[PDB]
Design a binder for this molecule. Sequence first.
Ligand SMILES: [Zn+2]
Ligand SMILES: [Zn+2]
Ligand SMILES: [Zn+2]
Ligand SMILES: [Zn+2]
Ligand SMILES: [Zn+2]
Lengths: 252, 98, 49, 49, 48, 44, 48, 64, 134, 48
Amino acid sequence: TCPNHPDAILVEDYRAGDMICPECGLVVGDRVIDVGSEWRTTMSSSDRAMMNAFKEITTMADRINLPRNIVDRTNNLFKQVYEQKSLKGRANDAIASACLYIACRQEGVPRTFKEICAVSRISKKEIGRCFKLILKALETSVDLITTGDFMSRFCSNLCLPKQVQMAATHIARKAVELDLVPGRSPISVAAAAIYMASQASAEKRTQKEIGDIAGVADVTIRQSYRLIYPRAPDLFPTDFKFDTPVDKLPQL
Amino acid sequence: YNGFTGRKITSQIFIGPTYYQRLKHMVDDKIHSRARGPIQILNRQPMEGRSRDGGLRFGEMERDCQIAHGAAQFLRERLFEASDPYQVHVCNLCGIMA
Amino acid sequence: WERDGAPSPMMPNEARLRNLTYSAPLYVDITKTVIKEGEEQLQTQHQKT
Amino acid sequence: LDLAGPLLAFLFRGMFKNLLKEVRIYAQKFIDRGKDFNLELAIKTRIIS
Amino acid sequence: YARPEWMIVTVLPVPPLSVRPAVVMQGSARNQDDLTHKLADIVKINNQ
Amino acid sequence: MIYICGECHTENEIKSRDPIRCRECGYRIMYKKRTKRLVVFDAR
Amino acid sequence: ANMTFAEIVTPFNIDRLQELVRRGNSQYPGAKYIIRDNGDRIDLRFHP
Amino acid sequence: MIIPVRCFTCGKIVGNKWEAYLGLLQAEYTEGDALDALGLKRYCCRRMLLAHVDLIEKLLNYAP
Amino acid sequence: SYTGYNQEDSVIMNRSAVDRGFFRSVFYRSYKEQESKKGFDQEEVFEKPTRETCQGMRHAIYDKLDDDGLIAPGVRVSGDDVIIGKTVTLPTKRDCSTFLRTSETGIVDQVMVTLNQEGYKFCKIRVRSVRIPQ
Amino acid sequence: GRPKLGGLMDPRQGVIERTGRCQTCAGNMTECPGHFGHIELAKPVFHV
Ligand SMILES: [Zn+2]
Ligand SMILES: [Zn+2]
Ligand SMILES: [Zn+2]
Ligand SMILES: [Zn+2]
Ligand SMILES: [Zn+2]
């Protein structure tokens, strides 16, 4: 509302916190900008139930050392779901656990259901149910998990060297590209690729160790390994150093 | 020897290597000025904007000092005209701001 | 622990640079014993909890 | 003179009492409900951290 | 200028917006002042 | 848009979408490359 | 250069002040603003 | 950090006398003899080398 | 007592010595900023604000900023310059850029980008200003 | 998108935004001194 030049983009000035006529210089408004405010340069049961959910999220997240950005993202997912109420009948612990799984998926650092189940009292089954309901309730979707998303965590938890982790990543990706493991779960393929890569290296790990950290039965690892084992020389990288040659890898 | 005229100084000067330290107090970090700068919208009084232009507090000691000086016009300017000059219309019959 | 969950030894310079807290994970061995008035006791130990 | 040791020992003593208090509450709720409790879940790592 | 009956609040005065302004923070969010928050409760209880 | 990995000093191009992780070392500290703009210093 | 004093324009300083107005803020000494008879303030740096 | 190019007080070039000075100290010359050999007559020039602390040698231990 | 300018604890200094580096020093100021998605309605991000993107922008030029919203090392900065271009989504998007004070004039020495303790994109800008005795 | 009459932010109480004027004063954010609203109490209340 310029007194002088209507339809003029008055220029906000920090020198005094006022607006000036951009084609006259007339100062409009005394000191209305409050530039410092612009640039720095007893409880509802609904809120109480939400507060308990937040305390539960930060607790579960801390057990797996999840970063705070994932917790904030999870809390925002929980608020929308809790406010949407289509899961009003479900337990907050299930919703929070399902929200935590979705937040990890949205952030691109997926945690398997067994991992989220291991930190929450809620079983994988109920987490799975609340997970699918939330996606519908939020009308959203999460990107499909891939074998490379678990290599970093499992190999690090297994104390595997960088080259073994890279080899396992290549082996798993190439096995999926070659479709050697149809319908297998990526975790099973990742675990099998890690087992193959580990056995080819000096840092050899058993199916139980890999199974316990990846959360996959040794049988599932053995089956998934048995499917990729015939193509092992094609699955390993061309620039890899073998402590045990690929042609001599354990056959079972 | 005097640098300007070259004449020897009558008194001999004590001179020698002494360890000196430069303190973190640079003048560029302390110089600040304020002239009709930004103000708080609630209080309508000076505040820092995007500089050190927050103004100086004209506290009780300055008021008392200016009172002893009898500079009632300057005292009024500093405590009013220079900080939050305002005017209102008041009803003569009910004394309330109209 | 990185976003992906891979643990890594933290160097103090990284802690200063990335605003991390230079902390050491603390673990405690816990032994759980349960008695069900059936003249039997079950003892289980949670290593490095 | 209370140095870093005596000062941190005083905090850790208080923070550990809360941890045990929190474990009792959680474990007792499950025991009252008539079910066993997972020790790994009762511990709230946020207390000490 | 002062009457005993005026000591009883039969009508409540609402301060001007400038005495309890609603600032814009972190975007378009109108952060209401503390008085506006209580004025909301006053009118709610008044209507109730 | 080049960033220098603080550990392996390896220059890598990163867009607004991809993460900060070093392409080869995985290190997460990246330093922007020195500006190409000409800055003149009087030797005083 | 940052602080200012409002000189009233008189026929005795009209010319001197006219000089300081054209000098503005870019050259010191100059002037920051002009206050007209209406009480409106004009910043010389916007329209010198 | 590094040896000053000119002596602050009088302007004598001293930035080229540091490795010469260190060479003389390795050759067992005393600090007084080394400064004399370098031709640092004034105590103002002598104060430059005698009191210098070559931290650049310490900064070069960190990889770029 | 050379000409009285050193009276009352004052000191007179050799201008030619100061010109030769006597007591010359460098002042480094490190500015830290992070982009956090706390609250799904708000999303702050580093990017150079553009006229069509922001419903309101000040006349201060953002040309010093790179396409990633951060100033590059070796660039001169003053209180009129923006060192970080940050913008938050409105429920158009608001600009929440980080400006220097009018007294702050120097050269950007180093700009590092990382993920802080919270996992949020974080950066520190170190500005180098040379303090000559005066 | 606009203030409502008879509400806590009733435009007669004062200017709502710095780029506006209240209809009662027709003055800007600084020109408007602000005006008082009132709440008739359904029941009298003791003034604390
Ligand atoms: Zn106009
Ligand atoms: Zn009246
Ligand atoms: Zn690297
Ligand atoms: Zn000398
Ligand atoms: Zn009004």
